[PDB]
Subunit: 269 residues, 5 copies
């Protein structure tokens, strides 16, 4: 598609908003531990590593249908162009809680250890599914068959196998420990991520309605919405909650999106 | 709601107000021996039995400042509203934490100083022309909260994530717990809020103080919060960590926040 | 006082420099532990908390007398010295880079000792009058030494904001940091800058350079104006806690350097 | 080579993309622990330090061949490819977000395992020729594997700067990071960017995005010029240490993506 | 001297390059632990603190002779070399990425060893004369080696600012960093830059690149001016502490590279 100029005039700009609930493993709102993974089940060896589906955080994705622009035989066409986004991790202050059941900070007269350890934040806004690259800590891990993982794994999958690719086309199915955004593709998606590891690391997060991320690339062009669909993807692992027994559950939070879009002219292909 | 027009120029078009908000850590009465702290945290015996005391739960601070009356005749084609333009804000008494002799848990053995306030911090301030709009989300949906507080009615496990029906307005001081409510980013068009969180149980608190820094409250259209009914809403929480006692019981510690807001007159189309 | 324009011309600009020695508790240069607090004496209970004056870090303050500007206080306009900018430096930072000082071993008795670490507090201010202070304490039941300046007749309200608990930083080595902090509701004529990191064992972080200048002008382009030709420099630089072999502990402080540039500002005679 | 102006016109710009797999020690794709080092083998003493080749992370390097530019090598001027900018990314970062991999429990046997943490080292470079290296080691008495490229006949001087300990990064997976680093006295024709955080258990920190570009032009507006139409990409990305059940440890590395934009630059015929 | 304008035309610019090897205590290139201090020897007591010379890191300093500018010192104006900018780099950073060196195990005897960590101190300066120093120590009762340059007849005042405790950094490997720091009340003809992070076990953090330049010009557009055509480069780069198996400890340092650009400045003949 040849990309032409921005369409001006009345009714040229639109806004959508949405939220994506976390998919930590307990992904059904009636689950007792909704917004958490099930207790982590650990490998006994290199050869034997069978994590349960409910213990693996996956990416969230939502597809937003935008107003229909083209009533298809005119020489040029219009596509929604995502220009900017306000995005927010909601319920951050829910972590400010030392009375929840858990492992004591000191002895049994103290509060309990709050959610801490590894965090992973990502959001993306694109005009099509986020393109993913496969890479795992162990190629001998047996992943649940009901999830989308790398077929026919080999030790090369512990690094870069150019054959290990996927589309983020299903909510709560693509494990974060298997897939990450592919920087060799994604010409029509903007993604932003941050990771801090460790076992007990204090999580750090901001929240404000004062910040906007601009989605335009170096040519001034934002993601272009193929078939008038807008793809929003996220993961927000905010750490690990430890139970009194010392079993552990990933904790995730929902993410809000507010995207501003405008009409962009393209040449009809 | 209303069609916003241009800024009103001329003499006395600008005003400024200052205020402070005391922390509401749980001991919220100034005669409370531990005013400015929570009571000893009472931990849940089980997920089914989680009954935190009201005095153990930090809540948002809110104050409403009545601004001068702007409109003599409410039938005129245009009217004026106070517009919050910028704010200087400051957490006060930061250096009170620089104290190693306060009763508590020794850093090393009985010859050393005591462990100062540390662990989870939560800082937030907001300036708006109406109550800060809130979204409910909890760590555990089976927690029973004190009934004299404002929390989510008839909680279900969905409330551990985003339930679009769990909405509130921050319309009462020392009543909305931080572990239940956070600013709703899907609303608050007429409020500007700023927040920061660092978790953990022993993390060193980090804070700045100065009178050289101003925050501009104008949105991308150059419009600040517009004060409905001439009321300015200031909200805050400033949990600076946890103090640990000799017995290893623990209290949240908060500090008060100062606001200096500059406002101007904005012309609006009469609805 | 109505503030008018900056006065141009030759000799319109002056510069001063000064240093402030820390006041950690041992505040006499003959004190064996000068630049440290005495061993922290800890409260046995909330009710019984009587810190020794020597264990309580206080603010440093110095008044610099500037060249007299007005030989005739009758003119319709007068001049005031305006603090425009400051280069400031915490001196002796590398003195902390020391693993042999007597103390608590990092590991066992074959290792170096634990260096100064834990809670830090850094503040400097430049003003045309004493720094204005707000009182707030960790515990209202603390009995402070009567020879220090602290809150009179404390009540639990002083654990938060009591609008009546105010003071001026008008004496060196007398106003405890744990009681007093800059009052953001005042200080129209002083610029202050403060940094705090808590914890018991936190690694201290400091920079030192002669390349950095802080501009003191407010949003109207006006710096602090020196009343009666007096410039107020205030500071505290608590760089952490030293631990002794017995596990007793001393606050450690460092001195601060100031180099202030001032210009002549015209004001209407009040 | 006298550098002249940028050649304008259609077809004056090209871009390449490449990925470099990590060289942590297990550097064969059929290695069970490909993308890790083997169990670290520790020195028994100062005198006796024989690390296995498989335990020493090395630099990754790839040479990208660019289109031919000059049909006639006798013309007074010639064209070279000039690297202008690069988008680069550490891939598979989220693979670390894994608490079930076999290893060492965080707490007791009911908990998850400790994820990859400790020392990290990230470096990328883009140049028109091999990255120039300087040799320096923690210990000159270490015996390095003979089929790696290390400093010949070390003496204690090699624990600091020995001006004779120089090399070119001209072999993938052969130059250990613990022996070699970018030489700042050379590398006129390469841009290199490096970041190190030490410690035994430090939480790793990484960002990933497709919104960030690094501009490679020097202070004269000239980027790396590709000699013989070759572009050199070099990298190391050690993301920490994995700890096994027995407490043995493996370095963990991640692959790096490059997307480089290049333009035609006129040079005087040498 | 009165400083006039920059001299333009061909050959008005020059560049020099140099490196400075660390002076951690073992300061002779034939020393087995060159680039480290000897095992820290800790004070028996406050009164008996006698650190060994080889345990005390000192500043590095090099004087570079520049081309002679004035063939006639009779002319009304003279030329001086003016240092305009510097590229500087800590070399060998990746040498610390090494878990096999003999030392203390991270966990038990099957794990790697703890890498260099704890207190770091980084400083570089570029000047037209020796860097001016201020004395300040953790303890005035320390007895320093007499073959080092330290504060004469120390008293407790030297635990803070004594305005008489001054020196010039005029000898390499002689001035202890724990005794001397840059004097911000002087150094009008030197630009210095310093960073400190303390703690016992802190992860060291360092970057390396050839993409960063520091401009040495002051607020008036004048860089350091080289008296007698001599350029002074000073540094210290303590990157942390190595812990041995026995738990004895050695400071670790790295060398620093400088690339300085200078131009010709006109000054009035005195
Ligand atoms: C009955 C019997 O003896 N069976 C053994 C079987 O135990 C053994 O498996 C290895 O046993 C060890 C026990 O200490 C570990 O459980 C190995 O798993 C790990 C480890 O923890 O060491 C898992 C870890 O994730 C792996 N590291 C990485 C980076 O993936 C390591 C790693 O492969 C090894 O440590 C080698 O560096 O292994 C477990 O594989 C098998 C295989 O040796 O032999 C049977 O006979
Ligand atoms: C001889 C005798 O029995 N005397 C007791 C006396 O011990 C007791 O005083 C309290 O004793 C406890 C011992 O566990 C502590 O020493 C109390 O001090 C602290 C504490 O460490 O808990 C100091 C601390 O600074 C306070 N917390 C804050 C936030 O300021 C707390 C706090 O007030 C309480 O823990 C309640 O949350 O106290 C010390 O007061 C007295 C009072 O019970 O009774 C005598 O009989
Ligand atoms: C054989 C004999 O009896 N000799 C003693 C000798 O031990 C004693 O010296 C003091 O001993 C104590 C033992 O706990 C400490 O080692 C003192 O050193 C320190 C300390 O660690 O406490 C060193 C430390 O650097 C100092 N602190 C600061 C901030 O400088 C402290 C400090 O001076 C005191 O703790 C006061 O706060 O001292 C060590 O001096 C001497 C003197 O008591 O008597 C001999 O006879
Ligand atoms: C069989 C026998 O008795 N052989 C000895 C042998 O003990 C000794 O070797 C030294 O043994 C000690 C025992 O604690 C250490 O293992 C020494 O290795 C280290 C150390 O851990 O101390 C390794 C470390 O990397 C080195 N430090 C640095 C900064 O490089 C230190 C260092 O050289 C010393 O601690 C001095 O500061 O050594 C190991 O060398 C030898 C040599 O003395 O003598 C045999 O006869
Ligand atoms: Ca591609
Ligand atoms: Ca909305
Ligand atoms: Ca006021
Ligand atoms: Ca060179
Ligand atoms: Ca001076």
């Amino acid at each position: 598609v040849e990309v032409l100029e921005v369409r001006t005039g009345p009714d040229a700009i639109t806004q959508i908003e949405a939220y994506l609930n976390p998919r930590m493993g307990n992904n059904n709102p009636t689950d007792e531990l909704y917004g958490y993974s099930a207790d982590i089940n650990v490998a006994s060896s290199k050869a034997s590593d069978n994590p349960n589906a409910t213990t693996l955080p996956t990416y969230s994705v939502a597809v937003i249908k935008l107003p229909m622009l083209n009533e298809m035989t005119c020489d040029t066409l219009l596509m929604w162009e995502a220009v900017s986004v306000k995005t927010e991790v909601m319920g951050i202050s829910s972590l400010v809680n030392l009375h929840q059941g858990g492992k004591y900070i000191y002895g049994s007269s103290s509060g309990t250890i709050p959610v801490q350890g590894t965090t992973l934040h990502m959001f993306s806004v694109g005009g099509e599914p986020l393109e993913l690259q496969g890479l795992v800590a162990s190629s001998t891990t047996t992943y649940p068959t009901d999830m989308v993982t790398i077929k026919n794994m080999k030790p090369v999958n512990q690094a870069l196998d150019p054959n290990a690719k996927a589309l983020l086309d299903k909510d709560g199915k693509y494990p974060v420990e298997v897939w990450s955004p592919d920087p060799s593709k994604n010409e029509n998606t903007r993604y932003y991520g941050s990771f801090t590891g460790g076992a007990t690391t204090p999580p750090v997060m901001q929240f404000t309605n004062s910040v906007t991320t601009v989605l335009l690339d170096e040519n001034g062009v934002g993601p272009l919405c193929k078939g008038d669909k807008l793809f929003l993807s996220a993961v927000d692992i905010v750490g690990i909650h430890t139970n009194y027994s010392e079993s552990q559950n990933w904790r995730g939070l929902p993410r809000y999106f507010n995207v501003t879009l405008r009409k962009r002219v393209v040449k009809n292909p």
